[PDB]
Amino acid sequence: SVLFISDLNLEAERPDITRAFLSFLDERARRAEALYILGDFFEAWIGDDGMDAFQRSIAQSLRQVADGGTRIYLMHGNRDFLIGKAFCREAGCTLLPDPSVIDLYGEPVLLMHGDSLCTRDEAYMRLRRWLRNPLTLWVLRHLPLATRHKLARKLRKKAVDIIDVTPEEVPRVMRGHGVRTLIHGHTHRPAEHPLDIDGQPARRIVLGDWDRQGWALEIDANGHRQAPFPLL
């Protein structure tokens, strides 16, 4: 089977989420063929050069799972888009771009964090565009850590208040990628939504966020299920 999770927002000051995630690795991800993490894995990320002990402990725990044979894939979210190849090498995972199409039991499946669909938030679309620009990334690379923290603070300054996807964007992007299944996170509204693309049934599955309870979507060749479980 294959596991999909997102929107954990890991941080040292939420040890309930940390304990839930680490046990999830031990009890479920170890036995899975693959684990996909679709963005907002960490609550913040200043860059791989600035990893602290907490963030390195999570790389170590991923790496134990990867060394045991489970393939792990990590995709950026709005909070942790500066995660890099160095972190992924430590963790033994593969960094997937947003968007990515994978083969899932013989079907092409589109994966995204989900914020790029939320196009009604115009201010955020403009900021996201700047943050993802290679030139921005280059300049960020060349800023000292302190100044990057200064910028994070400046930029920093419930689900209902997170803008949800633009409905029409969903079939548009699924059609363009040649898929009938999309899995994403970001909106904190876990669900499965059917839709129709050019007369064929399709589905959009939204992953749950871990602020109150853990979530995982598990898929095998015979079906799938997303359900919550307690953090403690």
Q: Which CATH architecture has domain 2-230?
A: 4-Layer Sandwich (3.60)
Q: From which experimental method does this structure derive? A: X-ray
141: phi then psi, degrees, rounded to nearest 5: -50, -40
